[PDB]
RNA sequence: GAGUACACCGGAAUGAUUUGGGCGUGCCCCC
RNA sequence: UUAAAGUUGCUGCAGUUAAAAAGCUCGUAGUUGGAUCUUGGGAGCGGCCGUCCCCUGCUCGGCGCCGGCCCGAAGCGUUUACUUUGAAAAAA
């Protein structure tokens, strides 16, 4: 009902249940004036390493500034409607391949792989923003991104960093660690 | 003005290695500098290098160790072939036991030994021993 | 110090150095919100304002342009804000 | 130092500095080899073992060897970590 | 350092790493656009527009709250001037130096600085011819200079 | 409704009732 | 005449005092030019790693099965240098 798929095909069951829960929310709360056209692209669940799981929710790119104003209430509502599950909102952005000479409009740089990954990283952590990135190369040659988070508003996201690393490994495929340093504030 | 960032990076590494320092700060970053340091660090001449990410141009801080003798560049990028590599490692390297020439290759940034047993060559970057 | 750590220095050295020569450069300025004691409005101004500004309602002048920081007039309180 | 048979052939393995990992030559008289005594855990006496640090002559000629010795003693566990 | 001076100075802005609209900024992008439109209709260069916005409106940068530059906004509206502002300022300085120089024939430092100013004008003019902002038939000329504001 | 302290309220919390303000979201006015 | 000559210096010279930075500056041709656009895995072998296959589109038609599927192909694909292979390149 509320969920819009970009392709004309059958939606799955988990995203259908999430859409039913959020439409029952906007019918049975004070958000029906602010969730009229606000649709959901898709949803997916993963297996976070440990003893829990998480839900990834896809959102169309004009609908980010609207959901960022009501991000705080929706995560609380999906927490109280589920059992013990943390939920994150991630935009769906398209990645175009590199225009090699073996293969037409010029590819915009917002659709490049690094720009998509940086946008996914900054949109995953909404209540705490990026105040510094560090990249460490271990002895086997692989990278290790270390992300610094701001000191203000840390009482909600001090325990969600493991789910953040899990979803960043699942969607992108790069190692990431989250820290709260003491330099500026 | 600034014309070659890899040259200044290797000169800074050489100067701080001669001074006995333990860490450096390369001011501009690039892909070729990261690949060149990756070749050194895979071959066991330096430690882990951290890339300080910002929105203009990154800075690289490598954990230096007492394991390096010299790092240098060959400007401009002279193209070499398989028949021209022997002269370069003859007049550029101390011995035929160690030391490497890193050269730009269509297979990637890679040293002269795998350039030899991959049967491919290209433009030269520099040397270290 | 031949083994000085450049990755994680103390914040006193970061505040000590130039605004361009840190690990990540940060400006030395800030945004402030000076208010008049005779008026009831609040106006947000820049620290290194380098212009003359008027209050909302055309009553007083808030700051005066100098070489560096703006010279706020006397009696008017202000506080630093952040985000 | 080795060959195809793998046997050792060098005259002697030279000592390396413990601060800069540089080769200490046979004619570098400014190089030292410091011995540091440990202590008993409870009674607090000389148990008998040795802790050895070697500093090349270039570091002492620079005059920045006490920082290196203090760093090596902090790494070994002699000097307290807070210091 | 400089292109026409032996000094090697270091004094410019230092943009912050943080990329977000501040939470205390209660100005919609359409609102700061409207302030930009009315202040550009007041007859100002984009430099003074950016100064006035950051000085009396609290916005850090326009392109961080609108996603678009000031001159691109004025070009999309259709009220950006044909002759750009830096070349206009250089031409104004050149004609002021020439107006000073025509009366004082003994002033040689004015002649040397005029030579430097026309050198900078020619370099900026050939770059603007390269990026097709100026037509290729445009040329700097003395008698044309007083005809140009 | 100029609002520094303000005067009427609508939502809303437990059939019935109701909790000093401002916009500088955190310290400023009155006790 | 060649090496010796690192006394013609591309490899590879010198310019404070020994031979040698134009008095200074602007400037066209020439030379040299900042960062950034696709990362990471699966199938297996020896014990994560040195080899193994993969991440450019449509009209004629052949390793085959019962109008439905794979393969081939008359036709074209953003251009340079660099790099590797192949042809041809008289003898002494």
From Swiss-Prot, chain B:
Origin superkingdom: Eukaryota
UniProt KW Repeat keyword: no
Localization annotation: Cytoplasm; Nucleus, Nucleolus
TM helices/strands, residue ranges: none
GO biological process terms, semicolon-separated: translation
Pfam families, A to Z: Ribosomal_S8 (PF00410)
List of residues that carry N6-succinyllysine: 87
Cellular component annotations (GO), alphabetically ordered: cytosolic ribosome; nucleolus; ribonucleoprotein complex
S-S pairs: none
InterPro entries, A to Z: Ribosomal_uS8, Ribosomal_uS8_CS, Ribosomal_uS8_sf
Main location per the UniProt record: cytoplasm
Keywords recorded for this protein, A-Z: Cytoplasm, Nucleus, Ribonucleoprotein, Ribosomal protein
GO molecular function: structural constituent of ribosome
Gene3D superfamilies on file: 3.30.1370.30, 3.30.1490.10
Keyword Thylakoid: no
Protein role: Component of the small ribosomal subunit. Part of the small subunit (SSU) processome, first precursor of the small eukaryotic ribosomal subunit. During the assembly of the SSU processome in the nucleolus, many ribosome biogenesis factors, an RNA chaperone and ribosomal proteins associate with the nascent pre-rRNA and work in concert to generate RNA folding, modifications, rearrangements and cleavage as well as targeted degradation of pre-ribosomal RNA by the RNA exosome. Required for proper erythropoiesis.
Family note: Belongs to the universal ribosomal protein uS8 family.
HAMAP family linked: Ribosomal_uS8_A (MF_01302_A)
PANTHER family (alphabetical): 40S RIBOSOMAL PROTEIN S15A
Subunit structure: Component of the 40S ribosomal subunit. Part of the small subunit (SSU) processome, composed of more than 70 proteins and the RNA chaperone small nucleolar RNA (snoRNA) U3.
Full protein name: Small ribosomal subunit protein uS8
Protein's gene: RPS15A
UniProtKB/Swiss-Prot annotation, chain C:
Gene Ontology biological-process entries: ribosomal small subunit biogenesis; rRNA processing; translation
Localisation: Cytoplasm; Nucleus, Nucleolus
InterPro entries: Ribosomal_eS27, Ribosomal_eS27_Zn-bd_dom_sf, Ribosomal_zn-bd
UniProt keyword annotations, A-Z: Cytoplasm, Metal-binding, Nucleus, Phosphoprotein, Ribonucleoprotein, Ribosomal protein, Zinc, Zinc-finger
A GO molecular function held by the record: zinc ion binding
A Pfam family the protein falls into: Ribosomal_S27e
Cofactor(s) annotated in UniProt: Zn(2+)
SS bond list: none
Sites of Phosphoserine modification: 10
Zinc finger (C4-type): 36-58
Basic and acidic residues composition-biased segments: 1-15
UniProt xrefs under HAMAP family: Ribosomal_eS27
Function: Component of the small ribosomal subunit. The ribosome is a large ribonucleoprotein complex responsible for the synthesis of proteins in the cell. Required for proper rRNA processing and maturation of 18S rRNAs. Part of the small subunit (SSU) processome, first precursor of the small eukaryotic ribosomal subunit.
Entry similarity comment: Belongs to the eukaryotic ribosomal protein eS27 family.
Protein name: Small ribosomal subunit protein eS27
Phylogenetic placement of the source organism: Eukaryota, Metazoa, Chordata, Craniata, Vertebrata
Gene that this polypeptide is encoded by: RPS27
Swiss-Prot record, chain D:
Annotated GO CC locations: cytosolic ribosome; ribonucleoprotein complex; rough endoplasmic reticulum
Localization, UniProt: Cytoplasm, Cytosol; Cytoplasm; Rough endoplasmic reticulum
Sites of the Glycyl lysine isopeptide (Lys-Gly) (interchain with G-Cter in SUMO2) crosslink: 41
Residues modified as N-acetylmethionine: 1
Residues in the signal sequence: none
Entries under Pfam families matching the protein: Ribosomal_S21e
Predominant location: cytoplasm
InterPro entries xref list: Ribosomal_eS21 (IPR001931), Ribosomal_eS21_CS (IPR018279), Ribosomal_eS21_sf (IPR038579)
Presence of the UniProt keyword Acetylation in the record: yes
PANTHER family in the record: 40S RIBOSOMAL PROTEIN S21 (PTHR10442)
Quaternary structure and partners: Component of the 40S small ribosomal subunit.
Protein name: Small ribosomal subunit protein eS21
Organism encoding this protein: Oryctolagus cuniculus (Rabbit)
Swiss-Prot record, chain E:
Subcellular location per the Swiss-Prot or TrEMBL entry: Cytoplasm; Nucleus, Nucleolus
Phosphotyrosine: residues carrying this PTM: 37
PROSITE patterns reported in the protein's UniProt record: RIBOSOMAL_S15 (PS00362)
Modified residue annotations for N6-acetyllysine: 26
Entry PTM: Ubiquitinated at Lys-26 by RNF14 and RNF25 in response to ribosome collisions (ribosome stalling).
Top-level taxon in the UniProt lineage: Eukaryota
GO biological process terms on file: translation
InterPro entries, sorted: Ribosomal_uS15 (IPR000589), Ribosomal_uS15_arc_euk (IPR023029), Ribosomal_uS15_N (IPR012606), uS15_NS1_RNA-bd_sf (IPR009068)
Keywords from the UniProt entry: Acetylation, Cytoplasm, Isopeptide bond, Nucleus, Phosphoprotein, Ribonucleoprotein, Ribosomal protein, Ubl conjugation
Cellular component aspect of the GO annotation: cytosolic ribosome; cytosolic small ribosomal subunit; nucleolus
Major subcellular site: cytoplasm
Assembly description: Component of the small ribosomal subunit. Part of the small subunit (SSU) processome, composed of more than 70 proteins and the RNA chaperone small nucleolar RNA (snoRNA) U3.
Role noted for this protein: Component of the small ribosomal subunit. The ribosome is a large ribonucleoprotein complex responsible for the synthesis of proteins in the cell. Part of the small subunit (SSU) processome, first precursor of the small eukaryotic ribosomal subunit. During the assembly of the SSU processome in the nucleolus, many ribosome biogenesis factors, an RNA chaperone and ribosomal proteins associate with the nascent pre-rRNA and work in concert to generate RNA folding, modifications, rearrangements and cleavage as well as targeted degradation of pre-ribosomal RNA by the RNA exosome.
